[PDB]
């Protein structure tokens, strides 16, 4: 691929560098349009700026804490972190969110990597060999209320068992109801004065419920579960203005009141360098 | 002969002329078209009320003063009371439409100022309350009057900071969206042809706004001395390749 | 079974390793692709779209006036603006080019710098737009500036000049992070003649400045950006 053509002196009526940006078109003006150039070659295909590569590496999307402890006399196993569940979203952690929100619509298969790490902060004396269940819970599937109830037997829910310390790995196809996920949705679920703006089921990717399969030890064990997401077979539409302000919420474009200026102020006037 | 400044757009019984145009934008180089059968899922035979709805509808004119921040309209919401298009929008469960948008602002060769005219697909607005506060239905559905970005914040309404595009992205980066400038020196009209842009083939028209039109002063209006310090801006919108599916009773929306 | 030795890195999770993995949803049939306009295949497409530069970042608050470069009538020979060309920094940091460039470590190729004049139609100005290639200072008196790559812009019926900043570097790639060895040089604008306003018009007129990339533009070594940040995870 030619990067620049050879070009010499011009004295001409064809003036490529004058245009009208009122038209909303940016003209493809080359350096050979206004300086004398030599011939150079690209040696460059642009592969690492493909949207398959730009959105196609594993990003941490959720960190959650579950505990292995004695569950006798515990009323609310959810509140005691005997299990935990997570509505799967790619907007809770903001480095991946800003990349996805360069586009309006995005279609991809998902690849999940789930890392579980343990710690015993208070007076343990051994190695707890623990197994984590991670259960993909679609909408309308029964959600767990106990860490050991009937819902964890996974007769139709996909679940994965893996040891604490090593990881899990599975792919999930594109499960959007529409042809792509909506990163942005200027609307409502229905016509109603009170109903929520922006949050739509058009980017629902499922839900994961996590528990420790082991009963309990003498000591407590805290398990941090880190879910990493990698998009693949990515298709993206409608490029957008990039996020400039801090995010405040999942599924909403709200930015905080009294934010710091995002455009840096010069150490001088407009003539400074 | 062939001049880029002199344009005629005829849809239905409506015609727009301009003698000071700047070469209409077709968004993403895609002319609006009807839904093909290979993309369709809804089994209903669609109604195509061609000349009765695919015509220019003129909204109320705004007044661009020297302290104006800008204006935002939602589509199809800005046309919800416009003739037969507004009636079909509430009687049908489903509908898809492209648009020809024509923003008009003339002045003299003594005036200066520049309007950005931009179409934003899925312009999900931010609340001014921050946090997880929603924006209520009556604020994202203002109708023909649109949203005045110099008006004050209201409870349940959007944030109206024009520098952050009402969504937390900077004003200078709106040019990735399809746009034209109305630079008063150069042109008095902007024309943007919008195809139907959505992740679904056809959609509900009252609960969802597909695109938003923003008209934003960038270079502020400077009038010659002694002249009236304001200019009118007129928006005229024509739906095109308009389909409606799922006829039933008329929807009742908050209004 | 077949005998096997296991290599270093076994059991590691490398976040950029692209391997096949079992589907949690066997026999699932995803929604049909419909045609949607504006499909993006590569980010090098959309950095060729010009966005506005907040060149007048002299205010203590983000505002629309930060995009407006002021011109003054009775000024000969003087500077209109200046900037360095660290495109992951300064006035370029919030532009679309600068924000995509901050996802990468290395950049190369030519930049497209545009100025749109927005004054009255009965006004006239000639400006000079100078690129100073690196190894010299930012120019100080327009005589220094025109010794480098420059354009004399006559403002007329066509309101927009396009100054390509040509790739002027010995090293094949520059850092997107500001680095002195890979500094890209300086951009400056000067009154070539002056701004002449018509009668009954007064005050300042404004330039709008635009940045995009030429199609020779190269971008590599993907990295995190510092622009977005958080302290805690976000919730519903």
């Amino acid at each position, epitope marked *: 691929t030619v990067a620049s053509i050879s070009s010499g002196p011009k004295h001409t009526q064809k003036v490529p560098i004058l245009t009208a940006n009122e038209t909303g078109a940016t003209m493809p003006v080359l350096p050979s349009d206004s300086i004398e150039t030599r011939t150079t070659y690209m040696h460059f295909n642009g592969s690492e700026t493909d949207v398959e590569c730009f959105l196609g590496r594993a990003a941490c999307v959720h960190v959650t804490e579950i505990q292995n402890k004695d569950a006798t006399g515990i009323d609310n196993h959810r509140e005691a972190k005997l299990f935990n569940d997570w509505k799967i979203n790619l907007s809770s952690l903001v480095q991946l969110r800003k990349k996805l929100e360069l586009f309006t619509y995005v279609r991809f298969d998902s690849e999940y990597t789930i890392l579980a790490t343990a710690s015993q902060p208070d007076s343990a004396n051994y190695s707890s060999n623990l197994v984590v269940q991670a259960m993909y819970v679609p909408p309308g599937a029964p959600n767990p209320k106990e860490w050991d109830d009937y819902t964890w037997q996974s007769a139709s829910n996909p679940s994965v068992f893996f040891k604490v310390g090593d990881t899990s790995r599975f792919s999930v196809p594109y499960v959007g109801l529409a042809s792509a996920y909506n990163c942005f949705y200027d609307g409502y679920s229905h016509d109603d004065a009170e109903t929520q703006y922006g949050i739509t089921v058009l980017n629902h990717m499922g839900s994961m419920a996590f528990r420790i399969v082991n009963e309990h030890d003498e000591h407590k064990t805290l398990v941090k579960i880190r879910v990493y997401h990698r998009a693949k077979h990515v298709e993206a539409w409608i490029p957008r203005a990039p996020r400039a302000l801090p995010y405040t919420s999942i599924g909403r474009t709200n930015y905080p009141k009294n934010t710091e200026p995002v455009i840096k102020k010069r150490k001088g*006037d*407009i*003539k400074s360098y | 002969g062939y001049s880029d400044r002199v344009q005629q757009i005829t849809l239905g019984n409506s015609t727009i002329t301009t003698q000071e145009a700047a070469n209409a934008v077709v968004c993403y180089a895609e002319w609006p078209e009807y839904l093909p059968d290979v993309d369709a899922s809804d089994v209903n035979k669609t109604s195509k009320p061609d000349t009765s709805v695919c015509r220019f509808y003129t909204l109320d004119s705004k007044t661009w003063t*020297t*302290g104006s921040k800008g204006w935002c309209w939602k589509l199809p919401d800005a046309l919800k009371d416009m003739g037969v298009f507004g009636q079909n929008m509430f009687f049908h469960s489903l509908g898809r439409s492209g648009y020809t948008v024509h923003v008009q602002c003339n002045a003299t060769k003594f005036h200066s100022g520049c309007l950005l005219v931009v179409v934003i697909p899925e312009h999900q607005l931010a609340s001014h309350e921050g946090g997880n506060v929603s924006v209520k239905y009556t604020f994202t559905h203002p109708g023909e009057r649109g949203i005045d970005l110099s008006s004050a914040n209201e409870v349940g309404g959007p944030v109206k900071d024009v520098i952050y595009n009402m969504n937390g992205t900077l004003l200078g980066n709106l040019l990735i969206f399809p746009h034209q400038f109305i630079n008063l020196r150069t042109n008095n009209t902007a024309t943007i042809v919008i195809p139907y842009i959505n992740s679904v083939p056809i959609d509900s028209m009252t609960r969802h706004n597909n695109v938003s039109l923003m008209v934003i002063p960038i270079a*502020p209006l*400077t009038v010659p*001395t002694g002249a009236t*310090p304001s200019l009118p801006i007129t928006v005229t919108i024509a739906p095109m390749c308009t389909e409606f599916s799922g006829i039933r009773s008329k929807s009742i929306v908050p209004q | 079974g077949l005998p096997t030795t296991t290599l270093p890195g076994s059991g590691q999770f490398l976040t950029t390793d692209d391997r096949q993995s079992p589907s949690a949803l066997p026999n699932y049939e995803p929604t049909p692709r419909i045609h949607i306009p504006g499909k993006v295949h590569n980010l090098l497409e959309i950095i060729q779209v010009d966005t506005l530069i907040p060149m007048n970042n*002299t*205010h*203590t*608050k983000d505002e629309v*006036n930060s995009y407006l470069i*002021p011109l*003054n*009538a*009775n*000024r*000969q*020979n*003087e*500077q209109v603006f200046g900037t360095n060309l660290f495109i992951g920094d300064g006035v370029f940091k919030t532009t679309l080019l600068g924000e995509i460039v901050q996802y990468y470590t290395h950049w190369s190729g030519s930049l497209r710098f545009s100025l749109m004049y927005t004054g009255p139609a009965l006004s006239s100005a000639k400006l000079i737009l100078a690129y100073t290639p690196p190894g010299a200072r930012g120019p*100080q*008196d*327009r005589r220094e500036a025109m010794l480098g790559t420059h354009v004399v812009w006559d403002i007329g019926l066509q309101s927009t000049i396009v100054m390509t900043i040509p790739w002027t570097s010995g090293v094949q790639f520059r850092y997107t992070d500001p680095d002195t060895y890979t500094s890209a040089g300086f951009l400056s604008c000067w009154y070539q003649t*002056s701004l002449i306003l018509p009668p009954e018009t*007064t*005050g*300042q007129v404004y330039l709008l400045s635009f940045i995009s990339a030429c199609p020779d533009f190269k971008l590599r070594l993907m990295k995190d950006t510092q622009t977005i940040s958080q302290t805690v995870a976000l919730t519903e």
Partner: antibody
Amino acid sequence: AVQLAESGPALVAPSQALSITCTVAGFSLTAYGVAWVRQPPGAGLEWLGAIWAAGATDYNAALKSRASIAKDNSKSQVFLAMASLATADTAAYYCAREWDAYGDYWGQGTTVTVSA
Amino acid sequence: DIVLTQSPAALSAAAGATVAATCRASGNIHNALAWYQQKAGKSPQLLVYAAAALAAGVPSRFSGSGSGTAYALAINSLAADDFGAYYCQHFWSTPYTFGGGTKLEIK
């Protein structure tokens, strides 16, 4: 440090030309304009004029025939020369420089009095 | 020609009260206004530029507001260094005329 220093004769007769020199320091006169402002004792600031960074000047609409500003880029000196001083020209005269297209870094000022 | 009309000529209040000088112009300034304070026997000091931005070394009590033709310097909870002169000056389209002036003297 950026400093502008006024230097005047501090006593002038009427129908005699005033000549005030503005020695500047810490910047070039090829890069920044210089503003002149006077203040009669008791009354408010009045803008006299400005020589811009490359030699163009603007003045009072009322004192345009009566005042002239020039500079020397080699001596770093800006000159305010007013002719035919009436009694209204008794003031403390100040120098400023261009800053974000405005005026600041005002020097201590020289006091000018004119009488018989 | 643009003339600035500043009100009021005198304000008298205690330390901790809030004053508000008002600046009006004969034509639109597009926020190209500065505010100056001047002590007795002292050069003027730039405090507000572009009608809203505080200068260097200016405390957060001073807040410049206003746009178009009407402009306002507001001092919230006056400290002891706030007394003296206050002047408008527009920097849109030479001549760069001043306002009349506003005094702060102790109640």
